[PDB]
């Protein structure tokens, strides 16, 4: 048993509605206004072919930038310098206001929600996970602190299999018989040797954070992500997030939004944690993110080969490079990239044919770094 979870609507029974009950009362009142949460759905456009390239400013310094973006399967690219959009690119068929899957850039959004609750004094990172989610007793999350989840310094037996099972449990892939019912149940199945302190990138960590958020606030993670972050950004559009059969948002990977709106998250980070709608996280939280995590914990050569002094903290990758670059990162080429030096945010949303190869990362990081340097005063 995974304990109490936020009801899908006021008074809803646990787990209700399901794909088979949503037409029945009392479910149908909510379901009729939220059917996309139950059944896959397409937009029917209220608006009735060519790539949009407005690289302009930095185009002078980077002549072949558009070709480089094409080579890295770029769907949306946006550079925010201060409060100004100084460069934009969208591939043919992807509109400026279209939303794009964030993959694990979603994690950095989740960490931000956790940080907001730390700022409020409702989460103490030093406390064990089980202080907030007792039902994780007996799992690999029995013992580690919330901060160790945030920094992903927990040794976990997570086949990178657990990765497929995780997706099946959450509805990203077709369910197999014997699979856990939902994301919460999947998390309780996870085991490890009990060691901590070394970085191990594991998507399960972020979903535990979201579960903690739910227990602390009583809100569905879907709503917490809005209340503590999205609704304070003055975003152009809602974000979306995939949900599993209990309505639990896929915190570690399932958010989609526009490139411009994602940049508003970076802007908030470079503004000391303050957004147009109010403070999201504390100045201290932002400083700790920009400062990085323990370097010695970071033993992922896939990262340190490019960023030798890099680290990871609070759901952000920290390059530790001379620019102090930090980034949200998601597979197939998603970055929410911060360049504090120039007070700039770079959003790149892509669809590399492959999820995570040295080849694509090399090309992608080359672009992000070149664009960052192009923004330097000269």
Curated annotation (Swiss-Prot):
Signal peptide: none annotated. Coiled coil: none annotated. It comes from the Bacteria. Involved in nylon oligomer degradation. The EII enzyme is 100 times more active toward the substrate than the EII' enzyme. This is 6-aminohexanoate-dimer hydrolase. It comes from Paenarthrobacter ureafaciens. The chain holds residues 9 to 21 of 392 of the full protein.
């Amino acid at each position: 048993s995974t304990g109490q979870h936020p009801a899908r609507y006021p008074g809803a029974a646990a787990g209700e509605p399901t794909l088979d009950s949503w037409q029945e009362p009392p479910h149908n009142r909510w379901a009729f206004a939220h059917l996309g949460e139950m059944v896959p759905s397409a937009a029917v456009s209220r608006r009735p072919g060519h790539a949009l390239a407005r690289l302009g400013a930095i185009a002078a310094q980077l002549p072949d930038l558009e070709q480089r973006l094409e080579q890295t399967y770029t769907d949306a690219f946006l550079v925010l310098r201060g409060t100004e959009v100084v460069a934009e690119y969208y591939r043919a068929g992807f509109a400026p206001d279209d939303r794009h899957l964030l993959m694990s850039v979603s994690k950095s959004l989740c960490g931000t929600v956790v940080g907001a609750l730390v700022d409020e004094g409702r989460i103490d990172p030093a406390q064990p996970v089980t202080e907030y989610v007792p039902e994780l007793a007996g799992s690999v999350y029995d013992g580690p602190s919330v901060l160790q989840v945030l920094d992903m310094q927990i040794s976990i037996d997570y086949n990178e299999s657990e990765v497929q099972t995780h997706g099946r449990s959450a509805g990203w892939r077709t369910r197999r018989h014997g699979d856990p019912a939902d994301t919460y149940e999947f998390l309780t199945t996870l085991r490890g040797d009990g060691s901590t302190g070394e970085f191990q990138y594991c998507s399960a960590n972020t979903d535990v954070l979201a579960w903690i958020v739910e227990r602390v606030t009583g809100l569905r993670y879907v709503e917490a992500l809005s209340t503590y972050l999205w609704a304070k950004l003055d975003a152009d559009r809602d974000a979306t997030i995939t949900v599993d059969t209990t309505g639990f948002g896929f915190a570690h990977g399932g958010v989609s939004c526009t490139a411009r709106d994602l940049a508003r998250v970076g802007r908030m980070m470079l503004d000391g944690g303050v957004a147009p709608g109010g403070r999201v996280v504390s100045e201290d939280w932002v400083r700790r993110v920009l400062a990085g995590g323990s370097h010695e914990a970071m033993t992922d050569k896939g990262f340190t080969n490019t960023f030798p002094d890099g680290s990871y903290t609070r759901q952000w990758w920290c390059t530790g490079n001379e620019r102090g670059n930090v980034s949200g990162i998601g597979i197939h080429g998603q970055n929410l990239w911060l360049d504090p030096l120039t007070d700039s945010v770079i959003v790149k949303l892509s669809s590399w044919p492959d999820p995570d190869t040295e080849h694509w990362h090399r090309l992608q990081n080359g672009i992000l770094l070149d664009v960052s340097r192009a923004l330097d005063a000269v």
